[PDB]
């Protein structure tokens, strides 16, 4: 529908004159006092932190600059700053801030208090059909979005899916997403998301999104992801096999969609062919769902995730609590100019 194109038009307008004069500098590390480590990684950590004059809370991720330089994380660190200062969507969690200092790069994204999908997916079991619909609405809405402005967002995962205030998804980890027009290359995306093309080293494309939205749609509506195993090296064999057991409460309708998504062949993947995204929202499997309700967040949620107040820890675990320390000499300066 004409809506729809204009909207989009208008989305890659506004994303692309970010993009091409990026925020840079907007805070700094003594704005903010610190409260307590939310998660933890490789090369940084995402901190609850609290600014020192409005009390506002917000999700900072550290990284560290000798750390992403090791890993070999430089690009993916820029691609994630440069997307998500540019990116405005429901569904996205908000980059607030950002800056760098000696030795570490910071993003302050807003506090999505609610926990991940994860926690609420482990806790009860299974999403029911309509709850594991009411999210994967979301995801293809913001897919639908991302790959109109070139994106791919390639971590489609539990773990990085928010359950906002309101019982909506905010995505968040922009680590490995990229404005691709083609194809790209790295391998990156945690093993039983990945996509076989991935698997196999070859140059792939906005495809692997979709194939991703199959396995997220498969664990919430089963409680366990389709090409499950022990180790990474045996999954591996089950994606590139394909071969999908379905439980038997699925509808035939969900197990229909999951066979389109969870398509080997990337060139017959479901949002991939011609009709593009429109292949999945047509499907069966949505005939319930009002997309213009679920874009206006007008859609009573399957659950609020349970919190006290925009403070709230509760949903997230516990770490050890290590120093986010400044060195007196700058590190990596050059490779992290343009952060
Ligand atoms: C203001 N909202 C729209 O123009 C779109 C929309 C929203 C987000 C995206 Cl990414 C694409 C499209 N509405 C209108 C009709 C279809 C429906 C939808 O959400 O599919
Ligand atoms: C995006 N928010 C997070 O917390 C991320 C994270 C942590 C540290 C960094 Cl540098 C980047 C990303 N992690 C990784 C998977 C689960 C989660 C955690 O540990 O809770």
């Not at 490789?42 to 550290?62: C, D, P, Q, W």
């Not at 540019?86 to 969690?93: G, K």
């Not at 999945?280 to 995730?305: L, M, S």
Request: charged share 25%.
């Amino acid at each position: 529908q004409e809506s729809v194109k204009e909207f989009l038009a208008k989305a890659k307008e506004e994303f692309l004159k970010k993009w091409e004069s990026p925020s840079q500098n907007t805070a700094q590390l003594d704005h903010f006092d610190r409260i307590k480590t939310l998660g933890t990684g490789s090369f940084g950590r995402v901190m609850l932190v609290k600014h020192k004059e409005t009390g506002n809370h917000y999700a900072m991720k550290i990284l560290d600059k000798q750390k992403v330089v090791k890993l070999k994380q430089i690009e993916h660190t820029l691609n994630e700053k440069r997307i998500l200062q540019a990116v405005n969507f429901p569904f996205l969690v908000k980059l607030e801030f950002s800056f760098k200092d000696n030795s570490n790069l910071y993003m302050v994204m807003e506090y999505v208090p609610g926990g991940e999908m994860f926690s609420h997916l482990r806790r009860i079991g299974r999403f029911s059909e309509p709850h594991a619909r009411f999210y994967a609405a979301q995801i293809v809405l913001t897919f639908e979005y991302l790959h109109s402005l070139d994106l791919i967002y390639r971590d489609l995962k539990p773990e990085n899916l928010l359950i906002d205030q309101q019982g909506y998804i905010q995505v968040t980890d922009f680590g490995f997403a990229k404005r691709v027009k083609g194809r790209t290359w790295t391998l990156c995306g945690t093993p039983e998301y990945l996509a076989p093309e991935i698997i196999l080293s070859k140059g792939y494309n906005k495809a692997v999104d979709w194939w991703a939205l199959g396995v997220l749609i498969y664990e919430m509506a089963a409680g366990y992801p389709p090409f499950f195993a022990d180790q990474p090296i045996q999954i591996y064999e089950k994606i590139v096999s394909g071969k999908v057991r379905f439980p038997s409460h699925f509808s035939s309708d969900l197990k229909d969609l999951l066979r389109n998504l969870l398509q080997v062949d990337l060139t017959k993947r479901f949002g991939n062919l011609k009709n593009g995204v429109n292949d999945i929202k047509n499907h069966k499997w949505f005939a319930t769902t009002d997309w213009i309700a679920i874009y206006q967040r007008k859609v009573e949620a399957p659950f609020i995730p349970k919190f006290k107040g925009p403070g709230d820890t509760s949903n997230f675990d516990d770490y050890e609590e290590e120093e986010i320390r400044v060195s007196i000499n700058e590190k990596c300066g050059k490779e992290f100019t343009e952060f």
